[PDB]
Design a protein around this ligand. Structure first.
Ligand code: HEM
Ligand SMILES: C=C1CC[C@@]2(C(C)C)C[C@@H]12
Length: 465
């Protein structure tokens, strides 16, 4: 056949005029009203197939999982990774690292009791640091992301950062800004015009330095691990990969060299931190906006764990209402609304379209999360989306915040755990009063580009009474 239809592109600038860089999501949703759920767009010179809604996205990413297992691009990030590392890599490189990483993560306790404790501990440290504010009005952004980043850092560096660490903050700051940048208008403008804007002055320059700053940190971290390596006992993820690097040194087709080490650790660092950090941060803002939902959450916590012992992960299966709330946040929040770009591994016949080898696919996860065929009033934050008539947890095939298919988020495991525990724990220990009245809180995002960024806010954590 021929390609998905779509608006007609002008030279160089592609479909710029039919897009609004500040609202990429909306702009493509607007166009889908004109061309159907499967269309082609032009982001500067990148010819992209946009997939929308539960069916289109599934049929590609799952039913034709192999054809769609390629990795497309994300210009800002790829500026630093240049195709190296587990995320922005392809083919042999990608299959190799993804394997190693899933396996290694698991070896250091992921999915098991080993990291559940590490999480329960760090959750401990948070409650402390929050009682430490003693009801004061604060921006939870860093409290949260400090706590999160510590779980992943615990794994990849083999040791948590102390909250006071002036560097730890520095780094957290950078991930925020990168994410923040890539969700701005200019950030999306950069996706289209990167081969030009890279040589120009502007926000992307500050953005580049932020990534270079993180690669520098990582690189300096790695070299310390080499210089102190016990090839018999790995302390952290970096060791495992180093240990493996040594083994593959004679094999010239090996995917385990230094660059891939640095970038995979960076990937794991950024990916493991800023996505969960942002989710929690949005959730709290929503919970405050629906005290109705806040209370019900407390009730189900008191009734199932009590203010007595600290929460355990299996404690999630007796608590549908909190599962429903975490889901509904993950759905409403829509942290990575357009996913990360995929790519077609070979020429592919999809429905009755023809997609060349190497064409980019933007799988609009948001459009699935908001598909009104699976969520009535998809626009509302309301946990009843994930609750049947009898107050039980009801799955949904459209709950795809971690994407689906051959390159889906292999952190979902870790992420689900981090998410349940932190939310539950903080709720057990505090009630939430906002710096404003629930009638005023504005929950709609400050930015939406590559990620969804909640607005900035302050809040107080008060004890329960
Ligand atoms: C709310 C939390 C998170 C969300 C919503 C999320 C979402 C996503 C999405 C949309 C993708 C792209 C899927 C695709 O290939 O099309 C992805 C992939 C990925 N995620 Fe996450 N993620 C989260 C947390 C994490 C965590 C905790 C880690 C590690 C600890 C992580 C590491 C990765 C990596 C390395 C990939 C690339 C997979 C590959 O290319 O094979 N993410 N995730
Ligand atoms: C390295 C990163 C930064 C953000 C990210 C998420 C979606 C895993 C793509 C991974």
């Amino acid at each position: 056949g021929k390609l998905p239809p779509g608006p007609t592109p002008l030279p160089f600038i592609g479909n710029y005029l039919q897009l609004n860089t500040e609202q990429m999501y909306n702009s493509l949703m607007k166009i889908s009203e004109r061309y159907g759920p499967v269309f082609t767009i032009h982001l500067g010179p990148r010819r992209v197939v946009v997939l929308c809604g539960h069916d289109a996205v599934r049929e590609a990413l799952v039913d034709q999982a192999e054809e769609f297992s390629g990795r497309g691009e994300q210009a800002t990030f790829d500026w630093v990774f240049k195709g190296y590392g587990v995320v922005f890599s392809n083919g042999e490189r990608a299959k190799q690292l993804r394997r190693f990483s899933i396996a290694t993560l698991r070896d250091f306790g992921v999915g098991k009791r080993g990291i559940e404790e590490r999480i329960q501990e760090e959750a401990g440290f948070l409650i402390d640091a929050l009682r430490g504010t003693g009801g004061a009005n604060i921006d939870p952004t860093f409290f949260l992301s400090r706590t999160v980043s510590n779980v992943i850092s615990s794994i990849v560096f083999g040791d948590r950062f102390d909250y006071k660490d002036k560097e730890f903050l520095s780094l957290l700051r950078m991930m925020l800004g990168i994410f923040q940048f890539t969700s701005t208008s200019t950030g999306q403008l950069y996706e289209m015009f990167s081969s030009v804007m890279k040589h120009l002055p502007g926000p992307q320059q500050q953005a580049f330095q932020l990534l270079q700053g993180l690669e520098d940190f990582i690189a300096k971290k790695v070299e310390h691990n080499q210089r102190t390596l016990d090839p018999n006992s790995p302390r952290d993820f970096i060791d495992s990969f180093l240990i493996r690097m040594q083994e593959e040194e004679k094999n010239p087709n090996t995917e385990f060299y230094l660059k891939n080490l640095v970038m995979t650790t960076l990937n794991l660092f950024i990916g493991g931190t800023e996505t969960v950090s942002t989710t929690l941060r949005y959730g709290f803002l929503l919970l405050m906006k629906h005290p109705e939902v806040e209370a019900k959450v407390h009730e189900e916590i008191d009734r199932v764990i009590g203010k007595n012992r600290q929460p355990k992960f299996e404690d999630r299966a007796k608590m549908p209402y909190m599962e429903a709330v975490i889901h509904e946040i993950q759905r409403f929040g829509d942290v990575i609304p357009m996913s990360l770009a995929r790519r077609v591994k070979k020429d592919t016949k999809f429905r009755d379209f023809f997609l060349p080898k190497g064409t980019e696919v933007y799988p609009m996860l948001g459009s699935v999360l908001r598909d009104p065929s699976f969520f009535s009033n998809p626009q509302d934050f309301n946990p009843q989306h994930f609750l049947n008539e009898k107050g039980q947890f009801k799955k949904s095939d459209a709950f795809v915040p971690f994407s689906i298919g051959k390159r889906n988020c292999f952190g979902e495991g870790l992420a689900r755990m981090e998410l349940f525990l932190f939310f539950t724990t903080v709720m057990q220990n505090f009630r939430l009063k906002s710096s404003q009245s629930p009638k005023d809180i504005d929950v709609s995002p400050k930015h939406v580009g590559f990620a969804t960024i909640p607005r900035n806010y302050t809040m107080s954590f008060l004890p329960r009474h």
